[PDB]
Symmetry: D2
Subunit: 114 residues, 4 copies
């Protein structure tokens, strides 16, 4: 139900071995750990959650861009990239969060399909 895909705009490649942390917003407005992993050789992280666990709510996907750039010897601007959204059951069932990374910029889009 939730996939993350990360691309590198400097090298023209998937962004491999990027740490990604997913959080769910709790009743008290704090961010509760939900899922995490490292992107694969294709820049993708699957297996984060199941349909049962992925209920409506506000989620935050934090992509550790700073460590990625540092490991390439590049000083980047951001601490991380955060993508914050509501999961809504009225919409399509599968969410892909995509991000395209540069040292001083990032872009993100959602592909929400059935």
């Amino acid at each position: 139900p939730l996939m993350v895909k990360v691309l590198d705009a400097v090298r023209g490649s998937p962004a491999i071995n990027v740490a990604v942390h997913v959080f769910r917003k709790a009743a008290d407005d704090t961010w509760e750990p939900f899922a995490s992993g490292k992107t694969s050789e294709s820049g993708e992280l699957h297996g984060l959650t199941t349909e049962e666990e992925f209920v409506e709510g506000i989620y935050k996907v934090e992509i550790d861009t700073k460590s990625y750039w540092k490991a390439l010897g590049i000083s980047p601007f951001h601490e991380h990239a955060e993508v914050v959204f509501t999961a809504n059951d009225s919409g399509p069932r599968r969410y892909t969060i995509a991000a395209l990374l540069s040292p001083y910029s990032y872009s993100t889009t959602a592909v929400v399909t059935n």
Copy 2:
């Protein structure tokens, strides 16, 4: 020292009346409110801080994209766009945070200059 510029990729226009909240990470790891404002008719927000107040630290610029799209009667994907960065750690710099908004996507870039 800190300016925010926001564009609308649907309209081909400045994104006007976008609320922006800036936070700074405190010594205890919480996000302290630092400044706020909203974008003008030109999509720009100036006057958030001063050179004196804009000390070294980790800053979070939260651009209230959902509120922007909902005020236009549109149901967008994201809650906000958050831009988190260390500032002024090699001395004072001027930062422009730019964002380009669509209902299911955004991009953001930084222009950092040494005065």
Copy 3:
């Protein structure tokens, strides 16, 4: 060896049924038709060329964004999106040209892998 992937930033979806034309730059600097098709239900167009036919050179991928937006009742800015690049044998073998579309903006990236 060549794939095109097109996404819609307004609807959060693949951009389906988008016409895509690929051209190769000829010796006289004109653009010679090379391959074309329409993106699938996943926003992808595969089957454009083969390894034998896809030799080094300058290629142009023209994405008919204007017709896409018109069919959704949206007046867009661009006539099309053009992505122009050199295929180089020294680099990785598989080229994916990705584009993310909005009415007054587009972004494009290359994912070049082995």
Copy 4:
């Protein structure tokens, strides 16, 4: 009436000294040279045309990204970034074409205003 702004996503800076060529489609379908220039220290290019000369038509703004990245000693993916659009077909407008550059990617947006 026509301005071009270019940013560098690697450096976090204006993209300076970027060559830009503008073409207009002629009645016979060829691309006629219309104007050209290069971006300033602020990444901006003004003075390409006048209200009188910038008539209705289909325009192509070619941003010479490869030449920019090669002048910096970098091997980029694209030859150029081309922005093709109909202009002034509901009367005169002011157009800003903005581009954000990385070695294997670019984005472009338009801001269109009615004076």
